[PDB]
Write a structure and sequence with these properties.
Chains C, F: InterPro entries: Xre/MbcA/ParS-like_toxin-bd. The complex is a heterohexamer, with four copies of chain A and two copies of chain B (about 250 residues). Chain A is mainly α. Chain A is built from nine helices and no strands. In chain A, helix 2 (about 15-30) crosses helix 6 and helix 6 (about 60-80) runs parallel beside helix 9 (about 110-120). Chain A is globular and about 60 Å long. Classes of the chains: A mainly alpha (about 130), B alpha+beta (about 250). Chains B and E meet through strand 8 of B and loops of E.
């Protein structure tokens, strides 16, 4: 009874679209992406980026997937580089032998974004 | 098709086999997404959204633990794994002994480092890892370390080309082999690894002896140390895997 | 009336939809637009330098790999798309509804052709 | 002497006792010192230097695992533990179930928070913890939640008065009690805890089911969530522990 | 076979005095302590601190023991506060109800340093 | 000559060393100084503002707690210090060789009072 009422008074039911919008903007900050670099990865303009704070990012949309893939890229980079931010930034902005080129440049296209993400997932010992 | 599987006539050598496996994986994935949001409740919802974009888990791996099912869902590196290619279902790769799992893990730390044409500016990557153990038992097994298949060990454990082992992997997969052991190509102690084609290879549904590890990756070495108990680092120099100068990759 | 880059990509997507027997909702979920934008491709075209154009090019490449793998036999291309697959994690057309799955189906077809 | 031990006739109720225990502990101690040096080898040497300045491990706890021996070496808070005082050997405190262990851990997160006259800045602390399980068996045990001693459960589960349980602990210690279970004062589901006087209570050699946890501590709640697998947070409001708008402590 | 490649020429044996000096100066910087505040905790002058970088901090000395306790204070604070530097510094410079006062002021004396360390050790899970 | 804090502390710790039967090497390991510097306390003094002075004060408080607990029986105070204790983690004199053990022995003696 004490646990039931205590949890009910503080329970948070967050919005999916608002959580994704907050997550991709936070990933953009930590990865050092400009407003236009993010726009070229998820495929919107900069007006829709600032519009995320009022509406959120529709998760079930095609833009949501690209944003989800972008968060997964940050997620795998964090785990692979132990959260060292500038090493994560270095990987995205440095030409790569195993990838077709600079990962951030590849992520500007959907086929390159999947290639960067698939590489980071596979090189994790988690597989 | 694999003619090494034909010379050995491995279909006659498919036999039941049991054993244990140990595997080193990364953590901090959940810590990563916690940095993006404000509450654990938001982080749990974000992790659910990220799950919907992942490649789907094979149906037989669904009832397994997260650490046991995850390797079966992601495709390997685009040059394929040693016994599996990009267009084939992923394999569960693990080692028989912990020292071999650290050697394999230390090698792929160098692979990540070597991919960047310019090394990371910090000169040293401090990451957190976890090892776990699991029991595996298959009715249809193969030992590539056995004398019938050991005559091709130079081609199966070659450091920089997967053609012969990948064709052998597709041959074993089509022949119904559920799991197989093989000699590690990176372990200095010549330890043996094990690969699982099917999630039904696991005896249990849970991993055992989850142990956190501290990892230190530099341009010269990779070092591992327990993160929860006192201990001395186990160091793996790059020279364990470098050939004629720089790290090879297929 | 005279060719443009957006007009040719449009017909390639429309023709691939007719050939593979895709519904208007299945095509909409693969390239990431609404069903009203599908009909606007024939009166205008599909912007090549857009995420929809990128996904459309990949889907059209999947129809290519299906055409070369099945020699143009239309029924087996449709049967492959709607049958659960061993080497894939599920049904190919269902996988193409997601971004990583569309790339995954194309990489699988390209390796076996 | 203990009035609760003189009453109830405690010596008559001493009997063998067995069970399992769960304990939630902090990690990141080794990560902490790794930030001070450059290499894992330097960190291993520094941890050895830090070990030499610590209070010595009791002779019977030395052969135990690091996670089992450490609670026996440090003194408790200056106001003592519930059943032990600053001048007596420390006890190994744990819970019988995981949810009770999380409640006791969440309470001491609030204790740390409430000690500062000004609350921590940013109003949120993201820390990492680990839980483990272990078997315990003694030939001389006591159940304080049992009918004989449960007549004093109000005095044994008091939220900010340790005098009666601390005197009972000394009386059980002198009477040769090796371990005892008791009703938790903080668990809202009224879970039971267990305390060990001696390291010989542990049946096994190694702690089991080591599980990493993510902890989020705010002014209003403490939340726990697995760090390695998909899960949903378990939330512990401050309202579970507050009395009159203040956190109670002896 | 080749286990000697990593069994040697990759493992170094550092000096204990140099490691302690390096660790206590890094703990000073992370906790935001001045050289005089550090000098009052371990009981040396600011000139003697400048020798640690060239000579080290001898571990067999009482000065070194106090430096070990100080590092353990940073070590416990990091684990307790998840490495959040602004919270670790806030703890040291804020009046504390459970301790006799502000922890940094208490650590200026030997008995206060032990008092702060014992509190941080006991409030940890693992006690 | 005028009384001074350094001379007062030196006289106190030297009087505690006498009654407890501590050698110069045992006292040196408790206050963290060399055996030669102990002999200079008589002529000059022990710095109160020093860490050695703080530890010397802690040692005096230990002697004061032993004197009050054993009623001044000098032979019983020496027996307590060099016998392994049932409630403590080791021999009290050995515990006092480190900073945290020196405080712990004083905390133990004040509580049993």
């Amino acid at each position: 009874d004490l646990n039931w009422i205590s949890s009910a008074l503080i329970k948070e039911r967050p919005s999916a679209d608002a959580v994704l919008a907050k997550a991709v903007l936070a990933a953009r900050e930590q990865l050092g992406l400009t407003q236009l670099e993010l726009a070229g990865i998820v495929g919107v303009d900069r007006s829709a980026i600032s519009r995320w704070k009022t509406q959120g990012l529709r998760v079930d949309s095609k833009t949501g997937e690209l944003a989800l893939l972008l968060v997964r890229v940050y997620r795998a980079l964090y785990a692979l580089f132990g959260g060292q931010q500038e090493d994560m930034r270095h990987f995205l902005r440095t030409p790569n032998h195993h990838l077709a080129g600079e990962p951030l440049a590849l992520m500007g296209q959907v086929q390159g974004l999947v290639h960067v993400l698939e590489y980071l997932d596979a090189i994790r010992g988690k597989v | 098709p694999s003619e090494i599987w034909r010379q050995c006539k491995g279909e006659r050598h498919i036999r039941p086999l049991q054993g244990r496996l140990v595997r080193l994986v990364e953590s901090q994935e959940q810590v990563a997404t916690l940095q993006l949001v404000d509450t654990l409740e938001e982080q749990a919802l974000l992790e659910e959204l990220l799950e919907s974009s992942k490649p789907p888990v094979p149906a037989d791996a669904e009832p397994l633990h997260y650490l046991l099912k995850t390797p079966f869902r992601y495709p390997p590196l685009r040059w394929g794994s040693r016994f599996g290619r990009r267009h084939e279902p992923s394999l569960f790769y693990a080692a028989l002994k912990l020292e071999t799992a650290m050697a394999e893990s230390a090698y792929y730390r160098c692979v990540l480092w070597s991919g960047m044409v310019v090394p990371p500016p910090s000169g040293r990557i401090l990451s957190e890892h976890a090892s776990f153990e699991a029991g595996w038992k298959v009715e249809r097994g193969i030992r590539l370390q056995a004398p019938p298949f050991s005559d091709h060990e130079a081609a199966l454990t070659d450091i920089a080309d997967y053609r012969a082992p990948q064709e052998l992997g597709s041959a074993m997969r089509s022949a119904g082999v559920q799991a197989f052991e093989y000699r590690s190509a990176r372990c200095p102690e010549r330890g043996c690894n094990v690969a699982l084609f099917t999630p039904a290879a696991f005896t249990e549904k849970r991993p055992r002896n989850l142990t956190p590890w501290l990892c230190e990756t530099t341009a010269g070495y990779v070092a591992f140390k327990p993160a929860h108990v006192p201990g001395s680092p186990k160091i793996f120099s790059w020279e364990l895997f470098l050939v004629d100068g720089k790290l090879p990759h297929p």
